[PDB]
Amino acid sequence: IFLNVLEAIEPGVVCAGHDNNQPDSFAALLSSLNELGERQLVHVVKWAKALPGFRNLHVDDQMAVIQYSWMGLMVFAMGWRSFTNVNSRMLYFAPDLVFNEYRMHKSRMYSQCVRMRHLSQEFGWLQITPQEFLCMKALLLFSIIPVDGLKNQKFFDELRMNYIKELDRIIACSRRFYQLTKLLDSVQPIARELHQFTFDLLIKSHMVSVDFPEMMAEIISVQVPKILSGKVKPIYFH
Ligand SMILES: C[C@](O)(CBr)C(=O)Nc1ccc([N+](=O)[O-])c(C(F)(F)F)c1
């Protein structure tokens, strides 16, 4: 039942709308990454709200958890796409936005990209199954919260525990749980580096000709700083 649901709600293909019939430029590549980020966020919201037990969360915490975990969720999924679509040879942000090393460099997000490429390879080296991937991604949604607590922390704690239990079941073991939780933990530092880069870019966006969609500008200026200033932190296993 649980896995039937995760498979059923898994987002389909999302395109960036990027113009690949034009020479690469920082401004065009980043505007497309931002646009793709917003397109994916729309799907992450619909995905999250259809997750088993998500409605158990207080209305106020439902949106907060999505916004705080959004980047990490995208990173994990992108890494899986890169692994399955091109065997980690390139970063598969979208069918129309595939990054080779030249683009990783041009984007000025090279360090972050190489770490995501490594994550992509991890899916292969650890022989992560599609089902482990699905359960792990759902768990990512409940892996970062405010130090001052959610409106109803207890309901969140219950749901997160339930998702960890589903992972236990998929695995069923100690050695595998160790590997998977280690992998999950590695996503956070990557999201953090992307958060910092996105924040800095938004602040100077008007100086580099980079367009930020309304919805993205809001999250990056209201939610992301809570994470960067230490008010909202990831829940690490290790
Ligand atoms: C630079 C920025 O546009 C900030 Br939102 C960005 O990180 N976009 C973005 C768009 C899509 C994906 N993605 O589909 O996975 C990601 C990723 F998570 F890779 F880093 C990032």
Q: Which DSSP string corresponds to 119-156?
A: HHHHHHHTT--HHHHHHHHHHHHTSEEETT--TTHHHH
Ligand 1 contacts (CB < 6 A) are 33-34, 36-37, 40, 74-75, 77-78, 93, 194, 198, 216
- DSSP 8-state code for residue 56: G
Closest CA to 74 of 53, 111, 48, 52: 48
What residue type is 134 in one-letter code? Answer: L
Other beta carbons less than 10 A from residue 199's beta carbon: 15
List the structure tokens of 168.
Answer: 């236990």
Rounded to whole angstroms, what are the CA distances from 135 to 101, 131, 132, 141, 231? Answer: 30, 6, 5, 10, 27
Separation of alpha carbons 212 and 2, rounded Å: 36
Q: Residue 117: what are its φ and ψ, rounded to 5°?
A: -70, -35
Residue 34 CB partners (closer than 8 Å, separation 6+): 210, 211, 212, 213, 216
Chain breaks in the chain (C to N over 2.5 A) after: 172
Separation CA 176–CA 61 (nearest Å): 31
What would be the CATH architecture of the domain defined by 1-238? Orthogonal Bundle (1.10)
Output the residue whose Cα is nearest ligand 1's atom 10.
Answer: 37
**Contact between 146 and 231 (Cβ < 8 Å):** yes
In terms of Cα–Cα distance, which of 132, 105, 119, 137 is closest to 40? 137
| Atom from ligand 1 closest to the CA of residue 107 | 1
Tell me how the structure was determined.
Answer: X-ray
Q: How far apart are CA 65 and CA 226, in angstroms?
A: 13
Spatial separation of the C-alpha atoms in residues 56 and 73, rounded to whole Å: 20
Spacing, Cα 152 to ligand 1 middle (Å): 30
Within the chain, strands assigned E span 91-94, 97-99, 144-146, 232-234
Residue reference for tokens 């992972």? 167
Nearest CA to ligand 1 atom 14: 93
Hey, is 53 helix, strand or coil? coil
CA distance 118 to 83: 10
3 contact partners, CB below 8 Å, separation of at least 6: 131, 134, 135, 170
